[PDB]
Design a protein around this nucleic acid. Structure first.
Ligand code: MG
Ligand code: MG
Ligand code: MG
Ligand code: MG
Ligand code: MG
Ligand code: MG
Ligand code: MG
Ligand code: MG
Ligand code: MG
Ligand code: MG
Ligand code: MG
Ligand code: MG
Ligand code: MG
Ligand code: MG
Ligand code: MG
Lengths: 49, 106, 49
RNA sequence: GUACCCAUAUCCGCAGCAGGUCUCCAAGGUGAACAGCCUCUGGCAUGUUGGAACAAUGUAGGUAAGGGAAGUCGGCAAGC
RNA sequence: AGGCGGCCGCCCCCUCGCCCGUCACGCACCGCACGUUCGUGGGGAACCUGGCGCUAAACCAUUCGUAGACGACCUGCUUCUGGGUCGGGGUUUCGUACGUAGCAGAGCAGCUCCCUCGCUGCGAUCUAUUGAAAGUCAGCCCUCGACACAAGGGUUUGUC
């Protein structure tokens, strides 16, 4: 990760961003759920219990 | 110098991947020989007719995914090879595959 | 790996403004760097030595 | 005269050559069918080599969002 | 693109470390060149001697995939926080496995306690067990659960 050798504004650098949602769906395939607690609360009980 | 005997659950479905249909089942035999040579240590590997039937029971391309095997190491006599020990791989049938692991057999 | 970000855009004069934007965003794991060595350089008339 | 081949190896083609050469016998199922496919009697080791990986390019096979011949001399090929 | 020079405290000697003058000698090799030099000139293999020190690293093999036509490149290998193989889970792909039971089921056939859904047998499917069963890294993640494996070899490499 190399620092930029020139200084530019361009209305593209140095703007305060606001993050809202970062998805953590299943990337090994098609993702359906966000968190493990949400997945277990949606699917309910199975043969694992 | 031991004469030991151990059971195994080889996974041919994850030891063969990307092999064509007309050569999928013969690669399983070389993979079983390589697995026996790696685990037991001797180069001489002899597999049985029951294991031959268990591998080739479903053709050339529908290779069974997991096979329960038993490996016995014995010595050779009567003008033996330079490799005195040899692994005699035999087949044992089992209905299920879950919660099965390597078992030393007396 | 790569994930999404739902991001608020504070860039005036656009259709993008005041709306959520989903972007393709990578993740780079960076462990801290343990300092080991110091190297000095001399300006030569062929470069740096 | 009476052996044997009668053939993708006993014939011809310079050869154990995807070439050519005249005939009889013909099962079960699906099926209109001696069509195509899978089995039985009967033969065979894949056709003058094997092992390892699956790069470019090629030879044969299959697909591909939207447009449907706008490419090309021509719907050539492929597909409905 | 550096290794010789300058200063101070001492060191064993030298007041001929140089020019002017006197004296006697050293090969005077008897006419002959390539002579005197920065030379204790540069490099290689060894020989006998003193002191001070050093105790490795590549390549193959095997494994690996972030890499590959073959070479080549990035990697692992300790007997304890090492790796490998099974198994366990996490993820996912497909869509509800065999067996069991049904007062579900187009109906059909058989029997008589002539039975007020009487009973049995065949019967595409359906229902509960069933978000079930099956595969899941060979190029997915974690495992201190179980097994053995581990310094085990072949080739090569030194600077007055
Ligand atoms: Mg005859
Ligand atoms: Mg011919
Ligand atoms: Mg012919
Ligand atoms: Mg017929
Ligand atoms: Mg008919
Ligand atoms: Mg006929
Ligand atoms: Mg031939
Ligand atoms: Mg198309
Ligand atoms: Mg389409
Ligand atoms: Mg059209
Ligand atoms: Mg038109
Ligand atoms: Mg034209
Ligand atoms: Mg045509
Ligand atoms: Mg079509
Ligand atoms: Mg089934």
């Amino acid at each position: 990760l190399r620092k930029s050798l020139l200084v530019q504004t361009k209305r593209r650098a140095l703007e305060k961003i606001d993050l809202k949602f970062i998805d953590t769906t299943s990337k090994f395939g098609h993702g359906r759920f966000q968190t493990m607690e949400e997945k277990k609360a949606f699917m309910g009980p199975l043969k694992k219990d | 110098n031991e004469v030991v005997t151990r059971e195994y659950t080889i996974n041919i479905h994850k030891r063969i991947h990307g092999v064509g249909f007309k050569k999928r089942a013969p690669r399983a035999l070389k993979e079983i020989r390589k697995f026996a040579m790696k685990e037991m240590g001797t180069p001489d590997v002899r597999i049985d007719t029951r294991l031959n039937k268990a591998v080739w029971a479903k053709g050339i391309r529908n290779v069974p995914y997991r096979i329960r095997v038993r490996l016995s190491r014995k010595r050779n006599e009567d003008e033996d090879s330079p490799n005195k020990l040899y692994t005699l791989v035999t087949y044992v049938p089992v209905t299920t595959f879950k919660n099965l692991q390597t078992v030393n057999v007396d | 790996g790569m994930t999404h970000i739902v991001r608020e855009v504070d860039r005036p004069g656009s259709k993008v403004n005041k709306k959520e934007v989903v972007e393709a965003v990578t993740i780079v794991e960076t462990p801290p760097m343990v300092v080991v060595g110091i190297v000095g350089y001399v300006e030569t008339p062929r470069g740096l030595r």
